[PDB]
Amino acid sequence: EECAAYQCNMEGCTMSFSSEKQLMLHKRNICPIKGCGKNFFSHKYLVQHQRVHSDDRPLKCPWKGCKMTFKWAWSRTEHIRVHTGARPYVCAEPDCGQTFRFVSDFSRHKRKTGHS
Template identity: 35%
Template sequence: MTLLCCHALCILVINKNCLNVKTFSRKGSLTIHQRIHSGIKPYICTECGKSFMTKGSLTIHQRIHTGIKPYTCTECGKSFTVKNTLKIHQRIHTGIKPYTCTECGKSITRKQELKIHQRIHSGMKPYTCASIKSYI
């Protein structure tokens, strides 16, 4: 049995093929993915009313209100609400830069920073100011 999503229509199918399909090994992952299409956010913060697609996202959000930061850097003592944020922070101490630009070889600590850096080579400028007018 394969769990898959065909475009905006997510369905459970048995041995069917579809172009441009996103597949899942667990039914729970498909259910969470389906919420992207439906917009359903069943987990609501009782403190501020903000809603989330997953219970985990709500739990992380609630740390804003409680001030709980369960992940602490052993090098400098700085605390974080999200484990992955701690992992990225620790690269400051280790010097690890796991992302490398294929154009110039520059090493970078975060994937998003690499995407931004690569715009230097591609010339891509995705943001436009609508307020600026040309004056002749």
Template identity: 40%
Template sequence: CSDCGKSFGHSSSLSWHHRTHTGEKPFVCIDCCKCFSHSSILTQHHHVHTGERPRVCSDCGKSF
């Protein structure tokens, strides 16, 4: 990273990291207009609006 000197094994990881310096958040929730730096984070956030709990604990069965 030219900003902090941190190094990454993949260029995609550097691109992901670079947004921590730029503050760029190009992914916007259509339900609440909250902005996110990466599409995967927006996808996780969307569960707040749908109530979906896609993961299940293998020990207790609780969804989250």
């Protein structure tokens, strides 16, 4: 529990450990995952790396029949548009008329072409 766990006091960190030993190793920027052993120059590099080990996708698609899962809410929201058929981003150029499901596709289109 909280009482027994050892919390990290680095700014922005939300990690905790089963022992003071593993907290001390964590403060030396050693990966928390068994068998990895990678060390990092800063605490920011460590936290970013740990995410690569995780296959956790907590957010389930709400569309009945769909078994897809997502790490981030924005990714899930973008995905749901596949089911609804929504194309929110419409090109403003006069003879284009092109639509896009994701903003990154719309941004890529505006960069690739010279469109408003």
